[PDB]
Structure 1
């Protein structure tokens, strides 16, 4: 079987299967490898006008739309996956979370502490894996599980 959240799917690329995780929104060509009491994650948050607090250290008033936020997230993911930029450099420069100053590190946490969509994605990632866009009331996240 595939690990939690993962499904094999048909891409629209010359009949090639890919794998998609409906908990983390990760997608990849490769079959995924393979739950802990705690995980350690970093994240990059992009807030939008419908965030719980449309404000960050980067911008006193966050006015971008949710759609615009998702396009930003998608672009960061593209740059991370291509190697053009590192997750940590992008989090430090562009995350609307205060954790940006710590390269997005949130430390370790248990189930029952974080916003549930964030928690669920985090615990479905294996160490070293990165999520796709994860939506919470804070905004849209890229999550990297580091331990």
Structure 2
């Protein structure tokens, strides 16, 4: 079995030893964890389908060589390739999921673009505005859980998610 009837909008309780205690696996964000998208705070919603109202999510970008912005926000050089660039993303995953830092110290103080200047240099759109690879996954959840390693024209993006 792979379902439930007592959880927030998103993630599906599996626990079928498909990795290591999937504990609610999101088919949209493709992320895993041992805690629902709320953590003793708020998990309301469950209205439509990823379109509760808006998203106004951010993006870390963090692009590498051969792309668009071959330069860091603090530095001024980039050579690492896609693979080597993937590691740069994990940094905002294992560290963020350390119950230490919040979701306001990754894209605001780290981002290979304008994002690393105004916290979230992305804004809200609600599909249609952005590109394909910036709507579906970006529609997952509706609070700020962030999805796995996505794929966008520039860099890779991690979708911080806010609303």
Quickly name the TM-score band, shorter chain normalised: 0.7 to 0.9
C-alpha contact (below 8 Å) 2:57/2:162 kept by paired residues: yes
C-alpha contact (below 8 Å) 2:89/2:158 kept by paired residues: yes
For residue 23 of structure 2, give the secondary structure of its aligned residue in structure 1. strand
Change (3 A) 1:103 1:19: same
Say which one has the larger Rg.
Answer: 2
Q: Which has the higher helix share?
A: 1
Change (3 A) 1:85 1:117: same
Q: Tell me the matched-pair count.
A: 147
C-alpha contact (below 8 Å) 1:88/1:104 kept by paired residues: no
C-alpha contact (below 8 Å) 2:55/2:142 kept by paired residues: no
1:94 aligns with one of 107, 110, 121? 110
TM-score, length of structure 1 as denominator length: 0.76
Q: Which ranges of structure 2 fall in alignment gaps of 5 or more residues? A: 1-5, 38-48
Higher relative contact order (CA 8 A, sep 6+): 1
Q: Which ranges of structure 1 fall in alignment gaps of 5 or more residues? A: none
Q: Which has the higher strand share?
A: 1
Q: CA deviation at 1:60?
A: 4.1
Change (3 A) 1:56 1:72: closer
Q: CA deviation at 1:124?
A: 1.3
